[PDB]
């Protein structure tokens, strides 16, 4: 599991993590996934 954390980031405006991924399991476009997750305030944000 790729993990990358960064403490002293100045939160100016709303952050986005984004990635291009090919999976063997079928994934329907438009569904919330447990795959790519961003944690701000150590709070879960879901990636769709």
């Amino acid at each position: 599991e790729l993990i990358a954390e960064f403490p002293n980031t100045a939160y100016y405006d709303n952050f986005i993590a984004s990635t291009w991924i090919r999976t063997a399991q079928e994934a329907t476009v438009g569904s919330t996934t447990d795959m790519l997750l961003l944690y701000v305030d150590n709070k879960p944000m879901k990636g769709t």
Side-chain angles (χ1 to χ4, degrees):
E1 64 183 1
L2 260 187
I3 60 161
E5 70 274 52
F6 273 123
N8 285 5
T9 62
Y11 204 168
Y12 285 159
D13 62 301
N14 323 324
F15 268 69
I16 171 168
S18 168
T19 191
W20 268 56
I21 199 147
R22 174 221 286 141
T23 61
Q25 177 202 19
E26 183 178 1
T28 72
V29 176
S31 52
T32 279
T33 64
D34 205 1
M35 275 193 42
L36 164 78
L37 303 169
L38 165 66
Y39 301 170
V40 85
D41 271 9
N42 265 17
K43 226 160 158 204
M45 309 268 112
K46 286 319 191 48
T48 84

Short mmCIF file of all heavy atoms in Angstrom, two decimals:
data_model
loop_
_atom_site.label_atom_id
_atom_site.label_comp_id
_atom_site.label_asym_id
_atom_site.label_seq_id
_atom_site.Cartn_x
_atom_site.Cartn_y
_atom_site.Cartn_z
N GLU A 1 0.85 -1.19 0.00
CA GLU A 1 0.00 0.00 0.00
C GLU A 1 0.89 1.24 0.00
O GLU A 1 1.69 1.45 0.92
CB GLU A 1 -1.01 -0.01 1.16
CG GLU A 1 -0.48 0.04 2.59
CD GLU A 1 -1.58 -0.04 3.62
OE1 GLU A 1 -2.76 -0.17 3.22
OE2 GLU A 1 -1.28 0.02 4.83
N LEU A 2 0.82 1.99 -1.10
CA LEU A 2 1.51 3.28 -1.17
C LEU A 2 0.97 4.21 -0.10
O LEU A 2 -0.23 4.52 -0.08
CB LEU A 2 1.33 3.90 -2.55
CG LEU A 2 2.49 3.76 -3.53
CD1 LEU A 2 2.21 4.58 -4.77
CD2 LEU A 2 3.80 4.20 -2.88
N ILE A 3 1.84 4.67 0.79
CA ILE A 3 1.48 5.63 1.83
C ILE A 3 2.40 6.83 1.72
O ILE A 3 3.61 6.69 1.50
CB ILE A 3 1.50 5.01 3.24
CG1 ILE A 3 2.88 4.47 3.62
CG2 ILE A 3 0.47 3.90 3.36
CD1 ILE A 3 3.08 4.28 5.10
N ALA A 4 1.83 8.03 1.83
CA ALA A 4 2.63 9.25 1.76
C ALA A 4 1.97 10.33 2.59
O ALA A 4 0.84 10.73 2.30
CB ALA A 4 2.80 9.72 0.31
N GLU A 5 2.67 10.78 3.63
CA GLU A 5 2.15 11.75 4.58
C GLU A 5 3.06 12.97 4.67
O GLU A 5 4.27 12.88 4.46
CB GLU A 5 1.99 11.12 5.98
CG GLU A 5 3.29 10.81 6.71
CD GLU A 5 3.86 9.45 6.35
OE1 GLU A 5 4.03 9.16 5.14
OE2 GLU A 5 4.16 8.67 7.27
N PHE A 6 2.45 14.11 4.96
CA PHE A 6 3.15 15.39 4.94
C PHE A 6 2.56 16.39 5.92
O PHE A 6 1.39 16.81 5.78
CB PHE A 6 3.19 15.93 3.51
CG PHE A 6 4.37 15.41 2.74
CD1 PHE A 6 4.20 14.73 1.55
CD2 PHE A 6 5.64 15.51 3.27
CE1 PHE A 6 5.29 14.22 0.87
CE2 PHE A 6 6.74 15.02 2.59
CZ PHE A 6 6.56 14.37 1.39
N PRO A 7 3.31 16.70 7.01
CA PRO A 7 2.73 17.40 8.17
C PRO A 7 2.58 18.91 8.03
O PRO A 7 1.56 19.47 8.44
CB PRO A 7 3.71 17.05 9.29
CG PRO A 7 5.02 16.85 8.61
CD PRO A 7 4.73 16.37 7.21
N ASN A 8 3.59 19.60 7.49
CA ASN A 8 3.63 21.06 7.52
C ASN A 8 3.08 21.70 6.26
O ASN A 8 3.46 22.83 5.93
CB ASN A 8 5.06 21.54 7.79
CG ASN A 8 5.47 21.36 9.23
OD1 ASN A 8 4.74 20.78 10.03
ND2 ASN A 8 6.66 21.85 9.57
N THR A 9 2.20 21.01 5.55
CA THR A 9 1.53 21.58 4.38
C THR A 9 0.56 22.68 4.80
O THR A 9 -0.34 22.45 5.61
CB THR A 9 0.80 20.48 3.63
OG1 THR A 9 -0.20 19.93 4.49
CG2 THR A 9 1.77 19.39 3.22
N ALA A 10 0.73 23.87 4.23
CA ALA A 10 -0.16 24.98 4.52
C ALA A 10 -1.45 24.77 3.74
O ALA A 10 -1.45 24.82 2.51
CB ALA A 10 0.49 26.31 4.15
N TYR A 11 -2.55 24.52 4.45
CA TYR A 11 -3.83 24.31 3.79
C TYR A 11 -4.35 25.65 3.27
O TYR A 11 -5.05 26.36 4.00
CB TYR A 11 -4.84 23.66 4.75
CG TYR A 11 -5.96 22.89 4.08
CD1 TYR A 11 -6.79 22.06 4.83
CD2 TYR A 11 -6.19 22.97 2.71
CE1 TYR A 11 -7.81 21.34 4.23
CE2 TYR A 11 -7.24 22.30 2.12
CZ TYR A 11 -8.04 21.48 2.88
OH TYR A 11 -9.04 20.74 2.29
N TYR A 12 -4.02 25.99 2.03
CA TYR A 12 -4.59 27.19 1.42
C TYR A 12 -6.01 26.94 0.94
O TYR A 12 -6.96 27.53 1.46
CB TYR A 12 -3.71 27.64 0.25
CG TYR A 12 -2.42 28.31 0.67
CD1 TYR A 12 -1.34 28.38 -0.20
CD2 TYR A 12 -2.28 28.86 1.93
CE1 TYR A 12 -0.16 28.99 0.18
CE2 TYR A 12 -1.10 29.47 2.32
CZ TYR A 12 -0.04 29.53 1.43
OH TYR A 12 1.13 30.14 1.82
N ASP A 13 -6.18 26.04 -0.03
CA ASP A 13 -7.49 25.69 -0.56
C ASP A 13 -7.58 24.19 -0.78
O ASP A 13 -6.56 23.49 -0.78
CB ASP A 13 -7.78 26.43 -1.87
CG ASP A 13 -6.80 26.06 -2.96
OD1 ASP A 13 -5.59 26.28 -2.76
OD2 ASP A 13 -7.24 25.56 -4.01
N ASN A 14 -8.82 23.73 -0.93
CA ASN A 14 -9.24 22.33 -1.01
C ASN A 14 -8.32 21.47 -1.87
O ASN A 14 -8.11 21.76 -3.05
CB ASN A 14 -10.66 22.27 -1.57
CG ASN A 14 -11.52 23.40 -1.07
OD1 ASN A 14 -11.40 23.83 0.07
ND2 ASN A 14 -12.39 23.91 -1.94
N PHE A 15 -7.77 20.42 -1.27
CA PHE A 15 -6.79 19.57 -1.93
C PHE A 15 -7.46 18.43 -2.68
O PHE A 15 -8.56 17.98 -2.34
CB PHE A 15 -5.78 19.03 -0.92
CG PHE A 15 -4.56 19.89 -0.77
CD1 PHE A 15 -4.65 21.14 -0.17
CD2 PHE A 15 -3.32 19.44 -1.19
CE1 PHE A 15 -3.53 21.93 -0.02
CE2 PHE A 15 -2.20 20.23 -1.04
CZ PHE A 15 -2.30 21.47 -0.45
N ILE A 16 -6.81 17.99 -3.75
CA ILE A 16 -7.23 16.82 -4.51
C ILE A 16 -6.04 15.88 -4.67
O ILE A 16 -4.93 16.31 -5.00
CB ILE A 16 -7.81 17.22 -5.89
CG1 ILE A 16 -8.03 16.00 -6.77
CG2 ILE A 16 -6.92 18.24 -6.59
CD1 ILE A 16 -8.84 16.31 -7.97
N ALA A 17 -6.27 14.60 -4.38
CA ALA A 17 -5.40 13.53 -4.85
C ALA A 17 -6.08 12.85 -6.04
O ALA A 17 -7.29 12.65 -6.03
CB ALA A 17 -5.12 12.52 -3.75
N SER A 18 -5.29 12.50 -7.05
CA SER A 18 -5.85 11.88 -8.24
C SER A 18 -4.85 10.91 -8.84
O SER A 18 -3.64 11.13 -8.76
CB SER A 18 -6.25 12.92 -9.28
OG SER A 18 -6.54 12.29 -10.52
N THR A 19 -5.36 9.84 -9.44
CA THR A 19 -4.48 8.84 -10.03
C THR A 19 -5.17 8.11 -11.18
O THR A 19 -6.40 8.01 -11.24
CB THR A 19 -3.95 7.85 -8.99
OG1 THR A 19 -2.90 7.07 -9.57
CG2 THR A 19 -5.03 6.92 -8.48
N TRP A 20 -4.33 7.63 -12.10
CA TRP A 20 -4.69 6.73 -13.18
C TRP A 20 -4.31 5.30 -12.81
O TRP A 20 -3.14 5.01 -12.53
CB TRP A 20 -3.96 7.14 -14.46
CG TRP A 20 -4.68 8.09 -15.36
CD1 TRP A 20 -5.17 9.31 -15.04
CD2 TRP A 20 -4.87 7.93 -16.77
NE1 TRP A 20 -5.72 9.90 -16.15
CE2 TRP A 20 -5.54 9.08 -17.23
CE3 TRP A 20 -4.56 6.92 -17.68
CZ2 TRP A 20 -5.91 9.24 -18.56
CZ3 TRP A 20 -4.92 7.08 -19.00
CH2 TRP A 20 -5.59 8.23 -19.43
N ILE A 21 -5.30 4.40 -12.83
CA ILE A 21 -5.12 3.04 -12.33
C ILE A 21 -5.90 2.08 -13.22
O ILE A 21 -7.00 2.39 -13.71
CB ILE A 21 -5.49 2.92 -10.83
CG1 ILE A 21 -4.86 1.66 -10.25
CG2 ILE A 21 -6.98 2.94 -10.59
CD1 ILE A 21 -4.45 1.80 -8.81
N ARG A 22 -5.28 0.95 -13.54
CA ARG A 22 -5.93 -0.17 -14.20
C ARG A 22 -6.03 -1.35 -13.23
O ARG A 22 -5.03 -1.75 -12.63
CB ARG A 22 -5.15 -0.58 -15.45
CG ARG A 22 -5.65 -1.82 -16.14
CD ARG A 22 -4.49 -2.68 -16.59
NE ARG A 22 -3.83 -2.12 -17.76
CZ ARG A 22 -2.52 -2.13 -17.96
NH1 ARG A 22 -1.69 -2.65 -17.07
NH2 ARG A 22 -2.03 -1.60 -19.08
N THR A 23 -7.24 -1.89 -13.09
CA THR A 23 -7.51 -2.95 -12.13
C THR A 23 -8.05 -4.17 -12.87
O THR A 23 -8.70 -4.05 -13.91
CB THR A 23 -8.53 -2.51 -11.07
OG1 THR A 23 -9.77 -2.18 -11.72
CG2 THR A 23 -8.03 -1.29 -10.32
N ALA A 24 -7.80 -5.35 -12.29
CA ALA A 24 -8.36 -6.57 -12.86
C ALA A 24 -9.81 -6.76 -12.42
O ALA A 24 -10.65 -7.23 -13.20
CB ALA A 24 -7.52 -7.78 -12.46
N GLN A 25 -10.11 -6.40 -11.17
CA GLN A 25 -11.47 -6.45 -10.67
C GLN A 25 -12.30 -5.36 -11.35
O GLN A 25 -11.82 -4.25 -11.59
CB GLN A 25 -11.48 -6.26 -9.15
CG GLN A 25 -12.85 -6.23 -8.50
CD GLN A 25 -12.83 -5.55 -7.15
OE1 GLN A 25 -11.90 -4.80 -6.83
NE2 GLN A 25 -13.85 -5.81 -6.34
N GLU A 26 -13.54 -5.69 -11.68
CA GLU A 26 -14.42 -4.76 -12.37
C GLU A 26 -14.80 -3.61 -11.45
O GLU A 26 -15.22 -3.83 -10.31
CB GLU A 26 -15.68 -5.49 -12.85
CG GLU A 26 -16.65 -4.64 -13.64
CD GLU A 26 -17.84 -5.44 -14.11
OE1 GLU A 26 -17.91 -6.65 -13.80
OE2 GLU A 26 -18.71 -4.87 -14.79
N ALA A 27 -14.65 -2.38 -11.94
CA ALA A 27 -15.03 -1.20 -11.17
C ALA A 27 -15.95 -0.31 -11.99
O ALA A 27 -15.56 0.17 -13.06
CB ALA A 27 -13.79 -0.42 -10.72
N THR A 28 -17.16 -0.10 -11.49
CA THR A 28 -18.15 0.71 -12.20
C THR A 28 -17.90 2.20 -11.94
O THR A 28 -17.81 2.63 -10.78
CB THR A 28 -19.56 0.33 -11.76
OG1 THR A 28 -19.79 0.80 -10.42
CG2 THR A 28 -19.73 -1.18 -11.80
N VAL A 29 -17.79 2.96 -13.02
CA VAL A 29 -17.42 4.37 -12.93
C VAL A 29 -18.56 5.16 -12.31
O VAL A 29 -19.72 5.07 -12.75
CB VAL A 29 -17.06 4.91 -14.33
CG1 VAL A 29 -16.77 6.40 -14.27
CG2 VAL A 29 -15.86 4.15 -14.88
N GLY A 30 -18.25 5.96 -11.29
CA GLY A 30 -19.25 6.63 -10.50
C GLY A 30 -19.52 6.04 -9.14
O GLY A 30 -20.54 6.37 -8.53
N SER A 31 -18.64 5.17 -8.64
CA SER A 31 -18.84 4.49 -7.36
C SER A 31 -17.72 4.86 -6.40
O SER A 31 -16.56 4.93 -6.79
CB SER A 31 -18.90 2.98 -7.55
OG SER A 31 -17.77 2.52 -8.28
N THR A 32 -18.09 5.11 -5.14
CA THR A 32 -17.10 5.40 -4.12
C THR A 32 -16.26 4.16 -3.85
O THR A 32 -16.79 3.06 -3.65
CB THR A 32 -17.80 5.87 -2.84
OG1 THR A 32 -18.13 7.26 -2.96
CG2 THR A 32 -16.93 5.67 -1.60
N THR A 33 -14.94 4.32 -3.85
CA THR A 33 -14.02 3.21 -3.67
C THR A 33 -13.20 3.36 -2.40
O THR A 33 -12.98 4.47 -1.90
CB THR A 33 -13.06 3.09 -4.86
OG1 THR A 33 -12.22 4.25 -4.93
CG2 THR A 33 -13.83 2.95 -6.16
N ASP A 34 -12.77 2.22 -1.88
CA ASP A 34 -11.91 2.13 -0.70
C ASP A 34 -10.43 2.13 -1.09
O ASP A 34 -9.57 1.88 -0.24
CB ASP A 34 -12.25 0.87 0.10
CG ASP A 34 -11.88 0.98 1.56
OD1 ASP A 34 -11.37 2.04 1.98
OD2 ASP A 34 -12.10 0.00 2.30
N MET A 35 -10.13 2.41 -2.36
CA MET A 35 -8.79 2.21 -2.91
C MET A 35 -7.87 3.38 -2.59
O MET A 35 -6.92 3.24 -1.80
CB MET A 35 -8.91 2.00 -4.42
CG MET A 35 -9.20 0.58 -4.84
SD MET A 35 -8.94 0.34 -6.60
CE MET A 35 -7.42 1.25 -6.81
N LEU A 36 -8.14 4.54 -3.18
CA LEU A 36 -7.31 5.73 -3.00
C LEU A 36 -7.98 6.63 -1.97
O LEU A 36 -9.10 7.10 -2.19
CB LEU A 36 -7.13 6.48 -4.32
CG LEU A 36 -6.62 7.92 -4.21
CD1 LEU A 36 -5.12 7.97 -3.96
CD2 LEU A 36 -6.97 8.71 -5.46
N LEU A 37 -7.31 6.84 -0.84
CA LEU A 37 -7.91 7.60 0.25
C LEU A 37 -6.97 8.70 0.70
O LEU A 37 -5.78 8.47 0.91
CB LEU A 37 -8.24 6.69 1.44
CG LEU A 37 -9.16 5.50 1.17
CD1 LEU A 37 -9.19 4.56 2.36
CD2 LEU A 37 -10.56 5.97 0.82
N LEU A 38 -7.52 9.91 0.84
CA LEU A 38 -6.83 11.05 1.40
C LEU A 38 -7.30 11.30 2.83
O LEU A 38 -8.51 11.34 3.09
CB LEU A 38 -7.04 12.29 0.53
CG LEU A 38 -6.72 13.69 1.05
CD1 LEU A 38 -5.25 13.88 1.31
CD2 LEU A 38 -7.17 14.68 0.00
N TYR A 39 -6.35 11.43 3.75
CA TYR A 39 -6.65 11.73 5.15
C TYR A 39 -6.10 13.11 5.48
O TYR A 39 -4.88 13.31 5.52
CB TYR A 39 -6.08 10.67 6.10
CG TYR A 39 -6.56 9.23 5.91
CD1 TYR A 39 -5.94 8.19 6.58
CD2 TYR A 39 -7.64 8.92 5.08
CE1 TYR A 39 -6.36 6.88 6.43
CE2 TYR A 39 -8.06 7.62 4.92
CZ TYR A 39 -7.42 6.61 5.59
OH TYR A 39 -7.85 5.31 5.43
N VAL A 40 -7.01 14.06 5.66
CA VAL A 40 -6.72 15.38 6.22
C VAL A 40 -7.37 15.42 7.60
O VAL A 40 -8.44 14.82 7.80
CB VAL A 40 -7.20 16.52 5.29
CG1 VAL A 40 -8.67 16.88 5.49
CG2 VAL A 40 -6.37 17.74 5.52
N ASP A 41 -6.70 16.07 8.55
CA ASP A 41 -7.05 16.02 9.98
C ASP A 41 -7.08 14.59 10.53
O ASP A 41 -7.73 14.33 11.55
CB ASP A 41 -8.38 16.72 10.28
CG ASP A 41 -8.21 18.20 10.58
OD1 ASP A 41 -7.10 18.73 10.40
OD2 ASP A 41 -9.21 18.84 10.99
N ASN A 42 -6.37 13.66 9.86
CA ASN A 42 -6.48 12.21 10.06
C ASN A 42 -7.94 11.74 9.99
O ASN A 42 -8.38 10.89 10.77
CB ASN A 42 -5.82 11.78 11.37
CG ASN A 42 -4.40 11.32 11.18
OD1 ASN A 42 -3.78 11.60 10.15
ND2 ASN A 42 -3.86 10.61 12.16
N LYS A 43 -8.68 12.29 9.04
CA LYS A 43 -10.08 12.04 8.74
C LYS A 43 -10.22 11.39 7.36
O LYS A 43 -9.60 11.85 6.40
CB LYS A 43 -10.87 13.35 8.76
CG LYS A 43 -12.18 13.30 9.52
CD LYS A 43 -12.63 14.70 9.90
CE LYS A 43 -14.12 14.77 10.15
NZ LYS A 43 -14.64 16.15 9.96
N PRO A 44 -11.06 10.36 7.24
CA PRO A 44 -11.19 9.65 5.96
C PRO A 44 -11.90 10.50 4.91
O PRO A 44 -12.97 11.05 5.17
CB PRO A 44 -12.01 8.41 6.33
CG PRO A 44 -11.84 8.25 7.80
CD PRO A 44 -11.73 9.65 8.34
N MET A 45 -11.30 10.58 3.72
CA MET A 45 -11.97 11.15 2.56
C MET A 45 -12.02 10.08 1.48
O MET A 45 -11.00 9.46 1.17
CB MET A 45 -11.26 12.40 2.04
CG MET A 45 -10.96 13.46 3.09
SD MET A 45 -12.27 14.69 3.22
CE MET A 45 -12.94 14.33 4.84
N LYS A 46 -13.21 9.86 0.92
CA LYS A 46 -13.41 8.78 -0.04
C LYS A 46 -13.07 9.23 -1.45
O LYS A 46 -13.29 10.38 -1.84
CB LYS A 46 -14.87 8.31 0.01
CG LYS A 46 -15.24 7.48 1.23
CD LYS A 46 -14.15 6.50 1.62
CE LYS A 46 -14.66 5.51 2.65
NZ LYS A 46 -15.98 4.94 2.25
N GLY A 47 -12.54 8.29 -2.23
CA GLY A 47 -12.19 8.54 -3.61
C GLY A 47 -13.12 7.84 -4.57
O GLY A 47 -13.25 6.61 -4.52
N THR A 48 -13.76 8.59 -5.45
CA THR A 48 -14.75 8.06 -6.38
C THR A 48 -14.19 8.10 -7.79
O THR A 48 -13.37 8.95 -8.13
CB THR A 48 -16.06 8.85 -6.32
OG1 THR A 48 -15.95 10.00 -7.16
CG2 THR A 48 -16.34 9.31 -4.90
#
